[PDB]
Each structure stands twice: as C-alpha cells, then as structure tokens.
Structure 1
Amino acid sequence: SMSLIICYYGKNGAVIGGDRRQIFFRGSEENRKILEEKLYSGEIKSEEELYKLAEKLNIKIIIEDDREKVRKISDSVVCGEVRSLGIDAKRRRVYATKGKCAIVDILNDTVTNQTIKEGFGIVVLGNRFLKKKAEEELKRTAKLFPMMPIQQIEDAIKEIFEKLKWHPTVSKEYDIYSVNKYEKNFEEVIKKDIESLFKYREQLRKQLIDFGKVMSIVNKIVKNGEIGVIKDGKLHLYDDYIAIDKIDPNPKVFKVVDVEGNFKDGDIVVIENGDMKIKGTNEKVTTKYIIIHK
C-alpha cells in the first residue's frame, strides 16, 4: 500500500527512492477505512498506536516489508510503483531516465492514464501525510537538483527518507537508485515492463480458472444415478455421464470405463449415495475412474 516514492529526473539523470512496506488489514470494511484515514492523515504516529487502535476496531494487521517498490531496470531506467490490491488491482508506476519521466496508471489489466514528462522535475507518490512532508522537505533542495551531482541528489533523497521513516507506513529499509544515461527507447522499455505485468496477471488468472475447473469437477461427482450398461466387461456410460482418470483441471475423459465385480453384459450400473453397484443384483462395482455429471 501507499508509503512514499520520490523520483527525480533531469538533465543529469534520474534518481528514485522508495521503501518496501505493505499493510494488510483483515476485518470490517468500515473499520478498515477508519484505520486507513488516521494512518494516512498523520494522526497515527507509530506502530504501537497503529496496533492499539486496530485491536480496538477488531482489525488484524499484517505488515510485510519484502515488497521492493522501486527498481533499477538498467543503466538508463529506474522505476517505482504504488499499488492497492483489493477487489481491483490499482497501480501507479513511475519510470524515469535522464531528462524524462513517465507515470502510468493501471486498473487491473487496463492502462487508464499515462503521463510523459521531459525536462526536469520531481514526482512524489504516497499517502497524503508523507507526500506533503516530502514535498515540504523537498522545497529546500529541489531547486538545486539540476545543478547537483547525482550522488548529492541521492543524499538529499535519503535524508528525506531518514527524516520520515519513523512513520509506520514506511519500512525499516528503503532503496535508492540512480541512473545517468539516456534511454533511447524509453517508451518501449515501459511497454515491455507493462506487458510483463499483464503476462503475470494472465498466469494468475489461469491458475484461478484451473482451480475453478477442479472445484467444478468435484461438485459434479455423481452421488446418485443410473449411469450406464455393462458390455465387454466395461461400463458404457449414458449420455449424461462421463468418466475421468483423476481430479485435475483438464483430465482424460472416458465414455467407456473399466470396471470390476460380479456382473454380466446388459447389467445396468447405478450409484446410490456414492456407492456404485449393479441395478437389481445390488452387487458391488469398483473402478479406478471417477464418474461425473456431463
């Protein structure tokens, strides 16, 4: 979630800093909201205040600080991201190279806004409180950045992260990266990075689709039915039914199923309460396969 990213771009290069902290809340949507407002307004000054207020509101907190939010893609490009994963996956990414910066907004699998900037400036992403304080701290050095060596800008940005990291939306560790080369294919590099996000999301989607196929197979298992007729020692299933070799997202399907037991050709196979037997005789029918409704 929203902590702090600070990004400079100018003729001397680009510099980005960001922390790593994510906070997950579990509990009522309304109390969640109350907690976030106080967290992002500056009312909540420490972790102890946060944990205390959360327990009073019946919200469980999970803080995870393994989220790298800024990266260095190459000699010429740095980037950062803020995001909110809820019902919707909301992201705002900043990319920067010497002399240029881009901001891209993404809702789920759609780019909803983009901004490209050339010249020099600063982009601050994060919560209101930290955004404002960083901007306030920045107004004292930001004018000087275009005339500074890169290391001094790094330092100026570190200083701001040192001054603000007491805040509980910030991790203990933060990352600073800079580049001093111009990326000639800036837009392509951004495009490729964004496509990777979409590929990754399409993979998660496939995993969830597969889970749903499996659950759907499990709910379709036959507990009751007249399912077919014995022929050549095999169960020839009726149209409403099919067999599968195992519970899997895309299993081998069978209409004609190897079975064992005391029956003969023309005997009708039934299942009642999940017990497979011969109609009339009531003799037991075993199989390796799983029978499901079409």
Structure 2
Amino acid sequence: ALVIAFIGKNGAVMAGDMREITFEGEKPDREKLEKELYSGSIVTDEEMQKKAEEFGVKITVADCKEKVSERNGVLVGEVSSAEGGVVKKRRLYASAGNFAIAELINTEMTLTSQGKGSNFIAFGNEFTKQVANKCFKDNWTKKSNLQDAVKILILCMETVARKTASVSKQFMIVQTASNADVLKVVEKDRNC
C-alpha cells in the first residue's frame, strides 16, 4: 500500500495507511491478480472484488494494521509485502534531521540506508509510491518547514485514499519534536 515520512531540523512527520490484505487461492493466480492491483488499475472496492471471482481469490481485509508507531521520539513504519512463504517486512525510523530504512526477512533485519539531514520517503506497491511522489512535489517547496508538509501528507494520503484500493481509507499520522539519533533503535531491534 503506502506510508510516507519527512525529516528536517524542526521535526519529523510519518503518515501510514492501515490496510492489510489476505490472499487465498491458486498462488499462480495470486501473482496474476496482484499485478493488477499493484500496477494501480482499480480503486473502488466493489470494482476490487469483481475481478477476484474472475480469477479465484478470497481476500479478507481490515483497515487497521498499525503501519506506523511512535517508539520514543522516532516514528517507525513498515510494509509487509509478504508474497508467500512467511514474512517480507520493510521499515523506517525517523526523527527531526535523522533517518534510516531497513529491510526485514522474518526475524532477520537488513539495513539499506541511513544518515542525517533532510528527506521525503515512501513505501508501497509500485503505483502508490509513485502517486505520493507526484503530490510531494505538487505541494512542496523548500520554502516550508514541517508545518505545511504535515498537511501535504494528508492530501497525498487522501490522494491515494481517493485514487486507490490497496490502501486503507482510514489512516494514521504521528509527529516528533526531537532530533533523536534514530540509530540506536535498529541495534535494539537486532538484539530483539
């Protein structure tokens, strides 16, 4: 689906949809259907289920996976793009000026990026990630601090609330005052 964060001197903003989707049926079919939703081709949920009995899939939903959490002045988000055997997670930590992104298999944690400074990020299905990328330039100028960007995230969250079905229509957003050096959280998660 999608979740997004922004990092700067003032603060950090992380917004995430709460939708998780369960796929049951011919696994070759599942990757045949999965294509179409990821590619972004439908939005209405009635136009979602339509196709499903065309291909053979039963698809339980609940728009309340808590895709971001606020552990201690750092905001954590995470996409469970599971696909089959077990677990395929993919998580971020952010604060004011500090930021990193990690890829999880099951228990195992693998990093992919870090550092300090200023950034805008998202994770998703290919399409959802693209639509956030549209909107962030849309409404973003360096002539903002946090405060505008916080609204930006909502429009973008609406924008793909609007134009898609892989993303829970309810969504949750959290903020930090703190330049917490997010680096530690990852080591604690690894000992865990």
TM-score, scaled to structure 2: 0.92
DSSP 3-state at the match of 2:65: coil
CA–CA distance in 2 between the matches of 1:155 and 1:194?
34
CA RMSD of aligned residues (A): 1.6
Alignment of 1:78-157 (within 5 A): 78-85=75-82, 86-144=84-142, 147-157=143-153
Residue in 2 aligned with 1:211?
Answer: none
- Which position in structure 1 is the counterpart of 2:71? 73
State the match for 2:156 in structure 1: 160
How far apart are residue 170 of structure 1 and its match? 1.3
Select 1:177's aligned residue among 167, 174, 180: 174
Equivalent in the alignment of 1:33 = 31
Which residue identity lines up with residue 181 of structure 1 in the other structure? S
Which runs of 5 or more residues in structure 2 are unaligned? none
Q: Which of 49, 52, 56 is the aligned partner of 1:51? A: 49
CA offsets 1:5-49 (integer angstroms, 9 cap, x no match)? 111111121111001001111100111111111101121232112
- Residue pair 1:150, 1:178 contacting (<8 A) in 2 also: no
Which residue type is aligned with residue 133 of structure 1? V
Determine whether 1:20 maps to 2:18: yes
| SS across alignment from 2:60 | strand
**1:114: how far off?**
2.8
How many residue pairs match? The answer is 190
- Which consecutive residues of structure 1, in runs of 5 or more, have no partner in the other structure? 197-294
Tell me, in whole angstroms, the C-alpha distance in 2 between the residues paired with 1:174 and 1:83: 16
Which is higher, the Rg of structure 1 or of structure 2? 1
Displacement of 1:195: 4.2
Deviations 1:37-84 (A, max 9, x none): 11011212321121010011111111122210011112x211100113
Q: Secondary structure at the match of 1:72?
A: strand
Going from structure 1 to structure 2, the CA distance change for 1:33 and 1:194 (only over 3 Å counts) comes to same
Is the partner of 2:114 in helix, strand or coil? strand
2:94 partner amino acid? A
**Cα distance, 1:135 vs. partner?**
0.1
- AA matched with 2:90: R
| Offset, 1:192 | 2.2
The AA in structure 2 aligned to 1:143 is T
Q: CA deviation at 1:149?
A: 4.1
Q: Which residue identity does 1:90 align to in structure 2? A: K
| Matches of 1:109 and 1:194, distance apart in 2 | 9
Aligned mates of 1:79, 1:90 — CA distance in 2? 16
Give, in whole Å, the separation in 1 of the partners of 2:68 and 2:159: 19
TM-score (norm 1): 0.61
Which structure carries more strand by proportion? 1
Displaced runs of 4 or more, over 4 A: none
